[PDB]
Design a protein around this ligand. Structure first.
Ligand SMILES: *CCC(=O)Nc1cccc(Nc2nc3c(-c4ccccc4)cccn3n2)c1
Length: 300
């Protein structure tokens, strides 16, 4: 329906999962004549691991890289909607279907309606591949589990990958972090999820705006004009502390919209929000993934 645009370079770490998804998804689409007869792409791939390890984000990256294929990102949030889901799949080949939080399935009447998904997997399906993703792979019943013949564990990020993701979640916003800073944020965040890092920087991003909304004084300052970044101007105002040279008793209401110079995102800012959040994952939840990682292996 709509095409994602995530490049390989943008996803941090996950080098192992990239090589397997290249071997299982991308290389067969670009080179169909290699996968003939005995070898054809697996019917469905299952991504499992701790929450916020990039499983869903990795699904968008693999969808962007085939380009020839089409991306149908259906949510975990009705059999005629999936009958046409596979019907529109087979008309446009090659194609892939990502089902985030596929632990959805597996007490209730909706339980009965869950059978419509397995009809399609085993009809003619060649250019269609189903990406499954979940954080609790064990609750999944055996009928779908035997259907994803390839299962990939997405691990917690490594220090280099966490340092990257602190830089990536910043984007183009004004900050004063050095490359040596990002590396230091990697070491201090051991066991932190990918979602956990995204939580930290959004709070750190909100401290400039909080400083503006709370400042009782502003100081005139030089800087690039908000109309043209190439022309330095002098009438800009930035939050100051009540005693700095040039303090003016005024709040953000008295600052014109085009005269505010935003304060930069510090490193102490990011450390201040790092200290206020702790890793979501626990050691118990991971060894339960260890239980799944060995009981069934790849297709058992
Ligand atoms: C090239 C532009 C771009 O895509 N930047 C960007 C911004 C945020 C994150 C990433 N890559 C990335 N995200 C993750 C996660 C993750 C983050 C947030 C929430 C859930 C998961 C986990 C693991 C790896 N990873 N890379 C790129």
């Amino acid at each position: 329906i709509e095409r994602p645009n995530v490049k390989w370079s943008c996803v941090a770490g996950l080098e192992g999962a990239k090589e397997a998804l290249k071997e299982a998804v991308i290389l067969p689409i670009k080179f169909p004549h290699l996968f003939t007869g005995k070898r054809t792409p697996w019917r469905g791939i299952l991504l499992f691991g701790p929450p916020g390890t990039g499983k869903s984000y990795l699904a968008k990256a693999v969808a962007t890289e085939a380009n020839n294929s089409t991306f149908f990102s259906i949510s975990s949030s009705s059999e005629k909607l999936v009958k046409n889901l596979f019907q529109l799949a087979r008309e446009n080949k090659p194609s892939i279907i990502f089902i985030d939080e596929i632990d959805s399935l597996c007490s209730e009447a909706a339980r009965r309606i869950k059978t419509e998904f397995l009809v399609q997997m085993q009809v003619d399906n060649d250019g269609i591949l189903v990406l499954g993703a979940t954080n609790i792979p064990w609750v999944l019943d055996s009928a779908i589990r035997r259907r994803f013949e390839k299962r990939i564990y997405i691990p917690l990020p490594e220090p280099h990958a966490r340092a990257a993701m602190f830089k990536l979640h910043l984007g183009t916003t004004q900050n004063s972090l050095t490359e040596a800073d990002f590396r230091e944020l990697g070491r201090k965040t051991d066991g932190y999820s990918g979602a956990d890092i995204s939580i930290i920087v959004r709070d750190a991003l909100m401290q400039p705006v909080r400083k503006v909304q709370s400042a009782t004084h502003f100081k005139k300052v030089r800087g690039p004009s908000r109309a043209d970044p190439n022309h330095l101007v002098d009438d800009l105002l930035t939050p100051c502390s009540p005693g700095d040279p040039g303090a003016i008793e005024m709040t953000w209401m008295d600052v014109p919209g085009d005269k505010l110079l935003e304060p930069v995102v510090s490193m102490s800012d990011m450390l201040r929000s790092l200290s206020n959040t702790k890793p979501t994952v626990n050691e118990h939840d991971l060894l339960k993934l260890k239980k799944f990682t060995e009981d069934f292996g790849q297709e058992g």
